[model samples]
Target: EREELAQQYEAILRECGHGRFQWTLYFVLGLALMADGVEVFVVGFVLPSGMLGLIVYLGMMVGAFLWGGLADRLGRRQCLLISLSVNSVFAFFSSFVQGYGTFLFCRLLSGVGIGGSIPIVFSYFSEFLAQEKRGEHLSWLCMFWMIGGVYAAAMAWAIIPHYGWSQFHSWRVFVLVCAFPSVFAIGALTTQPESPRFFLENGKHDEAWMVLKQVHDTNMRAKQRWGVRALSLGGQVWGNFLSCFGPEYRRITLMMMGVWFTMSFSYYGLTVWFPDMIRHLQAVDYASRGAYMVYFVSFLGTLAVLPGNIVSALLMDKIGRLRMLAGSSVMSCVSCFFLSFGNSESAMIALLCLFGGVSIASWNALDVLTVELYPSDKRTTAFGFLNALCKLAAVLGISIFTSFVGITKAAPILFASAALALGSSLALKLPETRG
Candidate 1:
């Protein structure tokens, strides 16, 4: 009877709220959190070759799916460490690349690590916080991305002008410098307990309590202190994962996957090609002036998302995740459509700004929704896999838009992408956080 009651108690807690330990995990992982932001743009600023410079774009595609698989099998912490270690090693060493081939090789290696980090970050962090705070915390996840971007930008501003373009070597130096912090973060993570909810659902009671104690002793903050014990796991982890495709969860899965794919197409297409696209639009020959405009426009776009993220984080509980995501996706679709009709410099800028802001919101949805729906046992892997799908779409977007933009106008590409977002948003139903 006692054991049975304990089982019930664990389920209750697992279903209800996250402990403070989870938020701290998010903080500790902030370095990797930011690493992702830095990596996405690092090569572009340092080299004129665009996606070709980071031969890793191809690696990112494969790494995304593979990392997700590892997370599902090994758990979040293990997968996260693997991501950081690989990212740091490749990023730091890549600084010495003497030619395009060498650089491409290093980037492919780095891409493997970069591809896995965010999905695991969101999946792992969500398991540690309350539902309301989950969205808030996840929203903050993207905000930290901006912080990382600013860090990269600051580094570029400080080092690159004096060093010049060949200093792509210096690019690796910056990555190496940032890599040290994650090492400390990984150390700090060891002191913390694992996710209590993860233990409960997986039928690891003692481990869950151990995690719970860490939450309590560490003075971790939580929306509620749920009174429940860890759970029992008769369900096979793989079978449970497959169950996500069962009738109950299939709809959620499809909608979320759609959001991931569409958002990646829109967001990465613009991001990867920012400077080149800007230069083409502006008819600039010299790269320095183009670099300056890239920074200006990029910073301006970053500023635009600040307020939007702040609002989403605060209102996520009140407004509901689905509503915000659906609305944001719709807005992105509209903005992208506007860009499709874009003719002049001002029009493109305006559309980019609007679309960029909406894309941030849409991206926030990927983090928030996945964290909310998937349980801890499979969360990391599920997120990793789904996120990989997004990146795959990004690869396609980068290829199609960059290659074809020379042959056709940017507007057509933007329009087609927007249509996909609109259709996907309408196709799915989002969960209600308050429930």
Candidate 2:
């Protein structure tokens, strides 16, 4: 017992120092993740007030590709920091747009900033983390995004109605406030080091050695004995870019891209339309408190999924990436079908709980898996392409499905999303990776 306790203590210490650097990256990525999720849905929540919201979504779609190319060109740090800074600055400024066009413009630029940020973060983290732990940490990383989603929703429920969306204009104020964390991230960027993978490939050995030394020292505190060796770099930027489409990568890229596309479609389509779905239900005057009731219940849904994320993170290594994802999608599909049978309030609640749990878990796992399946050098651009594809699917899903199927109807669309999730998961064919 004494020896085990000592071992545990040492493990914790190493995780904090070197491992903590990884966690710090998780936290930083989480912040960027939160920003991305919040910004995307906030538009859905606030769009009915004016035309600005539509423009923002469209702009974000385009920005995903343009900024992706830029990320490959500028490297991760320059692109990531700049993206966050832009998002913060523009988001705060957006609240002040006195007219429709001006509001649209602010939202558009803000969308671009946020569109670029997420892929950069995903690429950065996946490069550093062990395959054994990657899926789970990535899932936890996405939970931060859900936290941001809840924050935006809560802000809408509590603040938006009272003051109106226009009151948020000092968008810069909120952006500036959120900007503090990015500033915190800079310390880690300075203190720990660049991705060793990134450095060696970039031809910066001295910098890579410093980072490698710190990592070793951090591990040394836990009494682990292992020599650190940075991986070899094979080519320049263009060579790395072309490698993604080479024969070895083509299939995995397509599979992950498909997963990304459908997952985004299902996740965003459901979320963007959720409040509106509740609002539609309330319109029939089922209960005086119907809208508020649904809103509260949806909050409960988000809260309820927390444990599943934990489970996925804990089990991802043992379960394997594609299998865990497939399981979630299958569960979601069955639950969605069961939900259609729901007539009473209790049954509806149960269905929501099950479906929500599966959906959130699968979504989180997929993001991490997408990054892990790619080569280190191509991660950023690969993520960028995947992100772009996902967003496009989302745009199409919301526009076409809602118009034809409607959120209130629920059955067909829910089932459709589940089917797609299942298909995406089953399609994966990742290479073997070491812990």
TM for every model, in the order presented, reads 0.81, 0.79
**Model 1 quality (TM-score):** 0.81
**What tens-digit string does per-residue lDDT give for candidate 1 at 276-366?**
4655767743443725566555555555667777777777666766777777777766666666565655666666666666667666765
Q: Candidate 1: lDDT over CA atoms?
A: 0.64
lDDT of 1 at 367: 76
Report RMSD (Å) for each prediction in the order shown.
6.8, 8.3
State each candidate's clash count: 5, 10
Model 2 per-residue lDDT tens digits across residues 1-435: 333532443353345343646776677677777777677655654444443366666777666665665565556767777776776677767656676677578778888777876777777666556544666677777677667656655555554343233344433344334434444444444444566555655567677567657666655655223322212122333465567779877877776767666666665565444444445545544665512343455555666677778787788777776677777776665665665665555555565666677777667666666676665557777777777777777776666545643334564456456656555555444433321
- Output the number of the TM-score-best candidate: 1
* Candidate 2 lDDT for residue 421: 52
**Looking at model 2, which ten-residue stretch has the lowest summed lDDT?**
226-235
